[PDB]
């Protein structure tokens, strides 16, 4: 909600975005719309720093996890002080 | 536009006079037969025959004693712009038309990537002369409608 992270239906369940979140935002939930039978999910968008590496590892036509930068909070700005 | 002919412009025949005097100034310091004296003399003759050719081929000179080019197309002056220009356009297509043939030629291979970083010399030798007749060849492509494509652009 600080930043908005959205995952579409193109996702093929490869678990490459989840493994690449450096602050544990995304996670994997069951589906039935792929051969792998699992689609990603973003239930902890607060801590989302905005580091687009989460979607530099989604290998689809355009993309299946997308990140929109909104307002910035004290943790979405990664302030240590 | 008032540009007098260089063979007439006294300013043109002034610049020719100074640059000769300037060179002959630099010459009356070496030996009358050493290597510098010859190289200086060589450039002196090159200069005089340079000015003469500019006052011979109909170049028009302004008030600066310098040649001016009439690119308007007045065909009294065709060898200044138009004639060299057509000479370029012939060459430029030759480079253009040959390169196009090659890319098409190697297009139908397993990976055209390899045949462009490592150019096929023999294939580029049987294509290097086809640019002698590019105006004829291309103009037929345009009429036949193979010089261009219509809506199939990326991928294939």
């Amino acid at each position: 909600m600080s930043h908005s992270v959205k995952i579409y239906d193109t996702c093929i369940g490869c678990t490459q975005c989840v493994r690449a979140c450096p602050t544990d935002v995304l996670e994997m939930i069951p589906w039935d719309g792929c051969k792998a039978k699992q689609i990603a999910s973003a239930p902890r968008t607060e801590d989302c720093v905005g580091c687009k590496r989460c979607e530099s590892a989604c290998p689809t036509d355009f993309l299946s996890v997308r990140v929109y930068l909104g307002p910035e909070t004290t943790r979405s700005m990664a302030l240590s002080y | 536009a008032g540009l007098t002919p260089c063979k007439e412009s006294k300013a043109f025949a002034k610049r020719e006079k100074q640059s000769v005097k300037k060179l002959n100034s630099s010459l009356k310091k070496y030996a009358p037969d050493s290597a510098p004296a010859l190289a200086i003399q060589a450039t002196i003759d090159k200069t005089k025959r340079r000015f003469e050719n500019y006052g011979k081929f109909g170049l028009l000179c302004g008030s600066d004693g310098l040649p001016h080019l009439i690119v308007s197309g007045d065909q009294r002056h065709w060898g200044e712009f138009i004639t060299p220009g057509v000479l370029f356009l012939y060459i430029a297509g030759w480079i253009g038309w040959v390169g196009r043939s090659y890319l098409i030629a190697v297009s139908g291979e397993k990976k055209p990537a390899m045949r462009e970083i490592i150019i096929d010399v023999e294939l580029a030798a049987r294509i290097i002369p086809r640019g002698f007749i590019w105006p004829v060849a291309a103009y037929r492509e345009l009429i036949n409608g193979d010089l261009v494509v219509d809506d199939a652009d990326i991928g294939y």
């Binding site: - | 002369p129 086809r130 002698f132 007749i133 004829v136 060849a137 037929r140 036949n144």
Partner: protein, 205 residues
């Protein structure tokens, strides 16, 4: 098959039905039918203009020098004048009829036989086609109708081809020959025949 280059093989598309098929088209200039079909006429029209054209250049200068008659050089003929001939109007006049004859030929190749079914009388029969695109012999264009259209076409056109191919080259000679020598073509021949080992293009430069 006796190509132009003994060792080299002829290309695959110059099969040989066209007269003067000496397997010669190195630059890949005829590897499409519609291309090749339209190129043949060019060689036919060029050669015929280049057959008469050299003779007009040649014969006129031959008769003048010997002294039977007098005419200007073909190089010098463009500015000639006798009477009632503005080079303006002649250009328009020649452009007209040539424009007329050239087009109706063009319509023939574009549409065979769509040239002799019309209203204008008395001539609507001959200008059909010679039955071979580049040979429109009819009972007006071949007033001595002396062709069988098939047999000699292999053996006589091959004369008219190799005749023309030579003649087109010859005209190219004079243009360059007059461009360098500043003189007449036979003058070039007469000069070279005088001292051949000293009258050569090496000396002309």
């Amino acid at each position: 098959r006796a190509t132009w280059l003994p060792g080299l093989d002829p290309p695959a598309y110059l099969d040989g039905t066209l007269p003067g098929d000496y397997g010669f088209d190195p630059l890949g200039l005829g590897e499409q039918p519609e291309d090749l079909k339209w190129y043949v006429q060019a060689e036919l029209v060029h050669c015929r203009f280049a057959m008469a054209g050299v003779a007009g250049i040649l014969g006129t200068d031959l008769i003048r020098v010997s002294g039977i008659g007098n005419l200007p050089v073909w190089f010098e003929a463009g500015a000639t004048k006798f009477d009632f001939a503005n080079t303006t109007a002649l250009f328009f006049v020649q452009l007209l009829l040539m424009g007329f004859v050239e087009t109706k030929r063009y319509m023939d190749f574009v549409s065979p036989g769509s040239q002799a079914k019309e209203g204008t009388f008395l001539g609507i029969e001959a200008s059909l086609e010679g039955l071979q695109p580049g040979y429109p012999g009819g009972p007006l264009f071949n007033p001595m109708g002396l062709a069988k259209d098939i047999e000699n076409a292999n053996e006589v056109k091959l004369k008219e081809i190799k005749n023309g191919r030579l003649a087109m080259v010859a005209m190219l000679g004079f243009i360059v020959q007059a461009s360098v020598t500043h003189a007449g073509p036979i003058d070039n021949l007469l000069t070279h025949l005088s001292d051949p080992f000293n009258k050569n293009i090496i000396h002309a430069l």
